[PDB]
Symmetry: D2
Subunit: 497 residues, 4 copies
């Protein structure tokens, strides 16, 4: 419940402001999660997204049937075949628990500020301006007098006056018009609904596991026990699938340290979170959560409305540009697009400008000062493995190495290096198909699948050759190689011939 | 052309995320410039804006007659009378030089990507999809082949192919529909139009000076000579009016150091600036300009689209919230609202949430580390005056003083203190009506008018009494008093009785 | 029991190594305590000592009658009359408790390593190589088997084998010859003898108080209660006399924090201390005690064998030069001469080279880094008085002020400034005769007596005039003035006319 | 001509002051050069010196025949045979150029202050109190009026009044008695005598090279060309012999940077240097030279009068203790004993206490802060080799490794590690007999001879086994291994079985 959030020290020159950036968009360090939807169902669009900087594909299971998502998944596989050097991570976002209003007698009601509104748990009641149903049966046992209830993306706020067994009575706090089946939020209240419904269970056990998804973004995580429940559900079958809790309400913030301990990474669901804490507090939660994830070496995705005005316009606002840029400078591993790619009119443009902003933000980071801030903020007894990973980053910066090459079966070594944020690419070499796609969630890590049961030096030399072929390294460069993470080893190789 | 931009180190606690802020909105340090328009012409609205955190009123002279602005000005004076403790600064924003397209034969044209378009300097030609007039007579002598011309808020880009004496021939780079008399931008080209037209001259000499405006925001400043031209035009009559250059294009960025040297402060016109440099570079210019202004002790206003989605919605996006917050953490003195207050549907809501975001951002600043970053970055031989101002800030932080009280005729002393960013309010005491309204542009400075020819100790004691009455200080607090800025003096007073 | 001892960061140039220092020896910051003796009983010698840098005169009451010391004291007063601008502090060093061997049948004994030696408490027994008397009657109750007893300046060590009621039996650990009535030490044993004997009581009540001594250096302080006993003995009559405990054994080191809390300053009796802890540990105790005294703002005197080889030679060894220099860089307020001035053949030469070494050491101190080390190491809530004293030092360094002028009745203000180690002289102005001589123990403080019941500005202006006359300041210099230490005040004055 | 000399930050606890140190004296990091003489000609004494901490044997060729030194050398070899794990470096100190007075008619003269003295170049003239011969034939062409001439260890100073072709006329500046053939010094004058005389040539070519000496300490180096002359004289035959210039006068200080560039290390001849610069300046030259050698990674020996009072007493003074201790904290690689071991009465005691002081000083060094001071002070583009050596030191500190094992043919790798001052021992493994004895001059490096043409892993494993047998490492320890210094490699090994 305390974080000394420190920005990456920035160095900004006139040259960077004035000279065009002409580097490959996939050379960026920050990775992009793209939500798939009708606006990018074509294989042609998906290849264009790949070329624009897409690294992780998000399947939002709040909507759509398994066949709708399976058809999208298969078109992703074809795009993957035409871009075999750009291995994409596959992320399933659970629908999770929802609270909705009921139906209305005349399809719409005009709630008046000052008036009073009854919220009943009989979801079959046709509502009017005086009384509306709520799908959350335990609403009356969850809210207390004085609690605030938000309806329809927070367009209406209601103050709980009385609670009874099958209904609650509120005061409407502002006037607004609302329709049927609108979302509801219960700020500062723990929601007593299953983190994983049978619907969610089916999506995980019969889509995520069989289709080979790499991440589960678990909507509305409120406790470390929610994470353990999902881990147990995945079982040995899904044990290589990473669980990424979505922090969406005050419970998730209160228990963040313990949620993060059980997790493989975090997604900041900023939109939903702004309907539980006040909007002006969301930037504080973003910066605190990013800083805590940085300190633990756990990857974090910043999500929701980073380029929202791009759902219609081909260029973003000045605020959205700094939002993406500052999330990078804050220390995020990934940034996210939702409607900008799933349904908007400029999906390729959105990913393209997002990649360009990331490149500009990354270019101004002071990496020697970033490194020292991390080193000074981490507990003093570190493991041998972490100290060697640390020395790879240090050494690379001191000699201006073009690559750190990490040989890693589980990904552990590459994650330890990524924790210390080197200015050069981390090239992770793994014989695990899972590891090679799971490491995408970490800033600055690119992976190559290699064969099992190979000599370490053969693998490193093969990797250096591939790196040359991909213009990731050239003759006369130094590269760091780290492996064995009992002998943990750091070596420096000059690229010759 | 080099700035080691460093964020204010932030400290974020769970308490700040979760507990409501219940302090007066006018207690914030960051000041708000509000653009006046039809959406806030009522005296009732203007008083509501004052209470919501408005500190400087912007009169945008791009539109409106002197009588339209004079009627607004007089309604401001009445609002000022009902809020006599909230002295507002008055800012005139010059129309300045503009470039517009001409008229169209059928009111609209559909420009097709790949096609070619002739831009003529005969502003009387009725245009079609092949040929359109431009109001800038020296366009052909200003652009060269390869230059890019933006039309209609950058919705169309054109590449200059040929230049001739009275026209230019371009290639349309993307398809779009455009109307009549649309704005144009000439990225990376110096615009050879008068910084101050006879229209601008009339507004300055016959509105700003007579009506008693405190700032001129000079649109489209491209050089230090533009500033000197305006200073000379103001003459001895307007010598107390501060000139705030608006940085809007690449010329302004290239010559920023010399523009800043001649200026009293800077406004970042981010919207217009994003149509001259690439959008993804605007955040770099913002952070560089804020950091350079901080280092010089010159005040800076961050302007354009900070809460743009609020022109229609009563709540902002997640990106706009971080934009306002990060501009504060960047080190801006003021933030600005344009259409959000002049024409939008939620002017009071916009100022209100802007003030709340500022309060949240200011609360997480680490002030001891902010101070040390400034001290370490400033040239080593400082004046006696600056060293005493420095010691007031240091001393206040060390004893947790509630106020620094600065007695200052010109404002110079208060500006030196503001340069070092104390965590407590700076209460500037001046017998100058001009100084008392001009200091509003500096973060954290509040002013009180006092009588001339008074003993220093009488003034300080009167100020402490007024501070108690305004709940800015209480019995048992320490306050710093600084004056004489040859004997420069810092004293610490405990509040008793 | 923990100190992060940090040297003053040093800056050493070739110019300082090669160019002669031609400044007044009394301009140094480090002050010199000189032990008075037959080698400097002449008024002519004492004036020469003053001119060579003597600041405090030590009267060692281990030897001499009151008339011997009174005759010396009166000759000091005459030297003082011929140097009226060089006010000297007067320090009485108590004989305190001693432990001595007894008499010997044939005046000498040869103790053989491995043999055994009986130490009896009948001080009348004439001793031989097998059995020698000890003046400490409770020796057998103080030492335990395994304790080490040192005899004759540590030339013989003995291991306690058995203890009985009136004697102890030891093993001689090395061979040596010893005479009669030699000193003894009991390492790691608390000595149960009165801190103040009737002899010491007489010297304090009938010499120190009547003659107007400014300091009592209390030999062999072992506890905070020893200090309180001396404070009570001084009573209201001697309440302005400062108590300077001499740390001489392990008890004093163990209880150092609590001894320092009750004290006005510390003297490191390094010679005696090296006969209680191992010689190779004395430098650790020196650096720890100096650093703890620096942190508390209490003055410390480093004493014993700093220029010992000068008792006979006119030039010191390379080790003695670094010893004086490093004690300065360690942070000592004063350095001390004992036999080098009281009995040696080169008293004037010794003080002269000591002053020169101090000047060289002080010149290489990095004062901005010294200040920051102190500031970073002191508890975060400081008083108003300390913060203003701090700001005087800061401000002086930033503007290169030639003087900090402190108006102070008790000396408190001047001590707070001295704690932060300014590079310029601290000129303390006091109407107290006691304060004006007591502040001599603080590095870098020079005092001027002023009249009582004077306006502050009259006093400061008079002080500036005197400073000009003494070439401590010149026209065009800045000086800091601090007083009122409820209004505490710091002012900067430029010297004109 | 500028060094920001910074002490090693020290941490001093009560435990270190009070608890005895019971570790092996040869476990210290600082190495001891012992001057061999009649006081330690016995093989029994030399073995005792080894056990007390002697690391380098100094043969002072200012005195003695080749047979005298050869007999000593052979007795060293026998002591070496009885201590085969303690490989000693062999250092030849050249007589070099000397200036002496002539003979006297009555064996002694009493020079009177104020009188005048003629110094003639006819070395055959029998001198009196008015006229004395000088062995330096070019004296009159080297000194100018105003130069100071020192005679007989600086006991007499003379001011040059006139120079003529075969004599100089001086004024005696102080009275003293002098004998025949006394040393002379010419402060601030370059001495035009051969750095290497035929006598010195014979000692180098017919003792140092044939007997296998590892270092030449070249007395009275005044320029980089002196070093190059010695390097050329050594030729390919002596190319593995390190040249250690002795800095002894102002010329050596002025040209120190260029002398150091050509050198393998530095010896500070403090005694002789105090007769060329003022005594109070010698500590400045010591700290500057140590700091410059630290920054370059060149080893430095601090020499002369560190424990001088031990030539007669069995315990040192308080000043000599801090002198040894502060030279360690200053950053010296070696400390030196001259008469304390060659002729004194307590040679074993002197080395013993010197080792103990070194241990105490080394124990209080803050190594993380020492490392950061070095890293921050070294030029930013370092080699791959230096960055890997750096990472070994970093990694060792972070995991608390017990050893850094460096495989090195030339010693280069071990010197790069030693430059960064690890808190653990550096165990250098070399197949070079020369390297294994030359690395002794570097603080904290211990060597083991290994066979040529061995696999790296076999060597490291053999070294770990030997380290266990010598109690330098135990099961459960981590050790760093570094080799290959194109692939430079750092590995961490845990000690098992
Ligand atoms: K979802
Ligand atoms: K305008
Ligand atoms: K005494
Ligand atoms: K020699
Ligand atoms: Mg949600
Ligand atoms: Mg514009
Ligand atoms: Mg004593
Ligand atoms: Mg010599």
């Amino acid at each position: 419940a305390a974080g000394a959030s420190m920005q990456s020290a920035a160095n900004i020159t006139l040259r960077q402001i004035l000279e065009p950036n002409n580097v490959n968009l996939r050379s960026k360090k920050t990775h992009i999660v793209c939500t798939l939807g009708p606006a990018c169902k074509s294989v042609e669009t998906l290849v264009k997204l790949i070329d624009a900087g897409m690294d992780i594909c998000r399947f939002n299971f709040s909507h759509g049937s398994h066949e709708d998502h399976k058809e999208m998944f298969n078109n992703v596989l074809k795009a993957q075949e035409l871009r075999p050097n750009c291995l994409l991570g596959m992320l399933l976002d659970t629908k999770g628990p929802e609270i909705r209003t009921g139906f209305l007698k005349n399809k719409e009601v005009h709630l008046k500020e000052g008036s009073k509104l009854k919220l009943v748990t009989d979801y079959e009641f046709l509502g009017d301006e005086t009384c509306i149903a709520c799908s959350y049966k335990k609403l009356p046992q969850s809210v207390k007098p004085g609690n605030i209830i938000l309806i329809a993306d927070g367009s209406v706020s209601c103050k709980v006056l009385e609670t009874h067994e099958d209904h609650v009575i509120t005061e409407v706090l502002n006037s607004a018009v609302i329709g049927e089946r609108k979302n509801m939020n219960l700020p500062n209240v723990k929601v007593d609904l299953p983190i994983i419904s049978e619907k969610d269970k089916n999506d995980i056990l019969n889509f995520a596991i069989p289709m080979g998804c790499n991440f589960i973004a678990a909507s509305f995580i409120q406790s470390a026990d929610d994470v353990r429940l999902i881990r147990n559900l995945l079982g040995p079958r899904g044990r290589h699938i990473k669980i990424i809790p979505k922090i969406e309400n005050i419970e998730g913030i209160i228990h963040f340290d313990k949620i993060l301990a059980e997790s493989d990474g975090i997604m900041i669901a900023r939109g939903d979170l702004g309907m539980e804490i006040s909007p002006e507090k969301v930037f504080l939660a973003q910066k605190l959560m990013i800083s805590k994830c940085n300190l633990q070496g756990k990857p974090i995705i910043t999500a929701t409305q980073m380029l929202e005005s791009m759902t219609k316009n081909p260029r973003p606002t000045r605020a959205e540009v700094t939002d993406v840029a500052n999330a990078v400078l804050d220390g995020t591993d990934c940034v996210m697009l939702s409607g900008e790619t799933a349904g908007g009119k400029f999906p390729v443009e959105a990913v393209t400008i997002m990649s360009k902003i990331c490149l500009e933000a990354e270019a101004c980071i002071d990496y020697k000062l970033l490194y020292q801030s991390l080193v000074n903020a981490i507990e003093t007894p570190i493991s041998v493995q972490e100290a060697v990973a640390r020395s790879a980053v240090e050494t690379a910066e001191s000699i201006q190495a073009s690559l750190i090459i990490a040989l890693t079966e589980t990904g552990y070594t590459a994650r330890l290096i990524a924790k210390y944020k080197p200015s050069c690419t981390i090239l992770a070499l793994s014989a695990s198909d899972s590891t090679v796609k799971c490491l995408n969630v970490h800033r600055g890590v690119t992976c190559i699948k290699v064969g099992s049961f190979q000599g370490t030096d053969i693998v490193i030399r093969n990797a250096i050759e591939i790196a040359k072929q991909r213009n990731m390294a050239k003759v006369g460069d130094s590269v760091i190689a780290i492996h064995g993470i009992g002998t943990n080893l750091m070596k420096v190789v000059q690229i010759e011939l």
